[PDB]
Design a binder for these strands. Structure first.
Ligand SMILES: [Ca+2]
Ligand SMILES: [Mg+2]
Ligand SMILES: [Mg+2]
Length: 430
DNA sequence: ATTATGACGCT
DNA sequence: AGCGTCATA
């Protein structure tokens, strides 16, 4: 009843760049613009592995993780841009720097949480209050929401896409109560107006387009964002949740795409998020633990409390390289050469980070994989990170791992290593 | 032989 | 601490 919380206390958005690495390359090389194209890393093995795909290329069935040689079978005219290689390895600097461009623009509108290289959550609650004041009871024009979809509309008593969008938008705005400064639906709508503005600024100042979700929490915002891509934004209201979830596979919700989601489906014998409402909170906690159970009980009702954390910078800086199949490292000289290559890239990024962001990493984590282990990581050991010096870091990394060498011979390494990873962590102010 | 990342949970 | 899960380009 009147004491039942409804998770409508915040306005949260999730902004996510469209085919991000592709846009970065298309900005740089106008010949790639408005083409089926993809970004690939390496080239020798099957033409390289695809890591990003333009929407034009997606239409041919080209996807992430496809080998370029195979993508070309689906899309013969597919254009490719290659990730830079430095020190024998893929170097992602260009995309990290482009990400900083976008994050800095977003930060002008609101506090953001960097969620990945190309997405951020935004807490718009305060910005919406402010805007509502300027608005002075004044209605919101559809003109202010030129790329917004309202999930669930139109409904009730045209055959084109933009026409449908506008019909739904009209129904939404027609039903809005603008004299109520605490109406959650109104708050969301003003949130969407601001996100249009944010998205316009990103595109004007970088050339990059993005999509966005606006709702009352991060999970719904994230879900909303993916509903209409590319170059569009979607508002998911509290009221839209029961219908939206009634046919929403559990795996589509953030954090349920893996083993836990599979267990929810298996144990409960359900398929869709909305089906969760029929279980008590204790029932869910009994299956999935106290934390997950409470989370599931609220989430299937559209409610979630995880805050947008004030964090624009990554918490770790790492460098890693796989050495698959035949290329596995089998000599000490090999292992040491590559630890050095990694350590040199890490030093470069750490030094730039110290200058830009006034902080220093204090721990170095070293991880490897050995030929034969199904797990991505085989062994992870940390040591002190006291100086930004590549030779020192690589010498230290070798020290902490050198006893993983089964080989009775000093010069030989066995079993061969199929992955090396150096990660700087535990930052302190400087 | 997707690879190169990055955040957070468990014990 | 070291390991596991889930996620994104
Ligand atoms: Ca994206
Ligand atoms: Mg993304
Ligand atoms: Mg993606």
């Amino acid at each position: 009843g009147p004491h039942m919380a409804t998770g409508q206390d915040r306005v949260v958005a999730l902004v996510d760049m469209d085919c991000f690495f592709v846009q970065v390359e298309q900005r740089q090389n106008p010949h790639l613009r408005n083409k089926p194209c993809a970004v690939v890393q390496y080239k020798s093995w099957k033409g390289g592995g695809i890591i990003a795909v333009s929407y034009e290329a997606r239409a041919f069935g080209v996807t992430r993780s496809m080998w370029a040689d195979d993508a070309k079978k689906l899309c013969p005219d597919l254009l490719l841009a290659q990730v830079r290689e430095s020190r024998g390895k893929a170097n992602l600097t260009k995309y990290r720097e482009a990400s900083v461009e976008v994050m800095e623009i977003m930060s002008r509108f609101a506090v953001i949480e960097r969620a990945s290289i190309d997405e951020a959550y935004v807490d718009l609650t305060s910005a919406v209050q402010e805007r509502l004041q300027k608005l002075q009871g004044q209605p919101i024009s559809a003109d202010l929401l030129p790329s917004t979809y309202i999930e669930g509309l139109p409904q009730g008593p045209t055959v084109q896409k933009e026409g449908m969008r506008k019909q739904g938008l009209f129904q939404w705005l027609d039903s809005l109560q603008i004299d109520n400064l605490t109406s959650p639906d109104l708050q969301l709508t003003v949130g969407a107006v601001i996100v249009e503005e944010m998205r316009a600024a990103i595109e004007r100042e970088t050339g990059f387009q993005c999509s966005a979700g606006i709702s009352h929490n991060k999970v719904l915002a994230k879900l909303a964002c993916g509903l209409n891509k590319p170059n569009r934004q979607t508002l998911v209201s509290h009221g839209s949740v029961p219908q939206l979830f009634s046919q929403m596979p559990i795996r589509k919700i953030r954090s349920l795409g893996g083993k836990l989601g599979a267990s929810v489906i298996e144990i409960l014998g359900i398929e869709y998020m909305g089906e969760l409402t029929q279980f008590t909170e204790s029932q869910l906690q009994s299956h999935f633990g106290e934390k997950n159970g409470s989370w599931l009980y609220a989430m299937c009702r559209g409610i979630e409390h995880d805050p947008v954390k004030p964090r624009q910078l990554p918490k770790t800086i790492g460098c890693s390289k796989n050495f698959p199949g035949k290329t596995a490292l089998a000599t000490r000289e090999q292992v040491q050469w590559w630890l050095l290559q990694l350590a040199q890239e890490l030093e470069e990024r750490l030094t730039k980070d110290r200058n830009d962001n006034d902080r220093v990493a204090t721990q170095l984590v070293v991880s490897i994989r050995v030929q034969g282990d199904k797990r991505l990581s085989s062994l992870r050991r940390c040591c002190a990170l006291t100086r930004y010096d590549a030779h020192k870091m690589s010498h230290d990394a070798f020290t902490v791992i050198k006893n993983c060498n089964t080989s009775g011979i000093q010069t030989e390494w066995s079993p061969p290593l199929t992955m090396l990873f150096l990660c700087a962590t535990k930052f302190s102010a400087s």
